[PDB]
Ligand binder design. Structure first.
Ligand SMILES: Nc1ncnc2c1ncn2[C@@H]1O[C@H](CSCC[C@H](N)C(=O)O)[C@@H](O)[C@H]1O
Length: 236
């Protein structure tokens, strides 16, 4: 079984892995195979990418994605988790931000080639964008998948959220140390810790955590601090 090859897309084995992984998450990815297949072609190992599509799709284990919400994907890199999110939740109005121009260019290109409507890539720094009226507290959701610690991520994500909004920080197997000093820092930003959801990835069984930050009150004018300062002098 799964012998079929595919020059410009996911092989038969890759498609079947994505579908199986999808089902384990509770998703039917059949209507979306071609979009994911085209995304893979574009990223070009196969198994590794399908694992990234699926990790991105774990966001759907939280019921945060109903309707025409404005969503910010921060530090999206090659477009994760934002692009998989947008593929399966097409009503979301997505802005995918990255500080690296080539990444942004890749994302624009992916959006064009997948024919995604209501998604845009934006080149810029979180610290700068969050002090613009167009972006500050303009989003219902924000997401990031990043090595930058929760304390740092909170300062970068929270200022984008309208009150009542929520951010998801996608994290790996270990979150205890990053979480421990967090709640005081959230308070200063107008945030509250929501849920920390532990889960296992579909095919590998790797431990993951989704850390939900709730936006409780407006972020004071002092945050976020200047470009690179949150990273160098974390709030916690
Ligand atoms: N302050 C900031 N503003 C905008 N982008 C940032 C940023 N700090 C880091 N980044 C971007 O975040 C990305 C993290 S690499 C991770 C890529 C993608 N999120 C994934 O998980 O697959 C990098 O591409 C980097 O350019």
């Amino acid at each position: 079984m799964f012998h079929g090859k595919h020059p410009g897309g996911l092989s038969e084995r890759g498609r079947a892995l994505l579908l199986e992984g999808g089902k384990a998450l509770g998703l039917d990815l059949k209507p979306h195979l071609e979009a994911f297949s085209r995304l893979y072609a574009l990223l070009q190992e196969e198994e590794v990418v399908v694992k990234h599509f699926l990790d991105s799709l774990t966001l759907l284990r939280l019921p945060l994605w109903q309707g025409p919400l404005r969503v910010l994907d921060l530090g999206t890199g090659a477009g994760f988790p934002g692009l998989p999110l947008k593929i399966v939740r097409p009503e979301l109005e997505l802005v995918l931000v990255d500080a690296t121009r080539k990444k942004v260019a890749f994302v624009e290109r992916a959006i064009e080639v997948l024919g995604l409507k209501g998604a845009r890539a934006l080149w810029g720094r979180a610290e700068v964008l969050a002090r613009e009226a167009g972006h500050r507290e303009a989003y219902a959701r924000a997401v990031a998948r990043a090595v930058a610690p929760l304390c740092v991520l909170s300062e970068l994500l929270l200022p984008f959220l309208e009150v009542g909004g929520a951010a998801v920080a996608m994290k790996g197997p270990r979150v205890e140390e990053e979480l421990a000093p967090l709640p005081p820092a959230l308070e200063r930003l107008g945030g509250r810790l929501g849920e920390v959801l532990a889960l296992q990835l579909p095919l590998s069984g790797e431990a993951r955590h989704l850390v939900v930050l709730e936006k409780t009150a407006p972020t004071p004018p002092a945050y976020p601090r200047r470009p690179g300062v949150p990273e160098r002098h974390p709030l916690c």
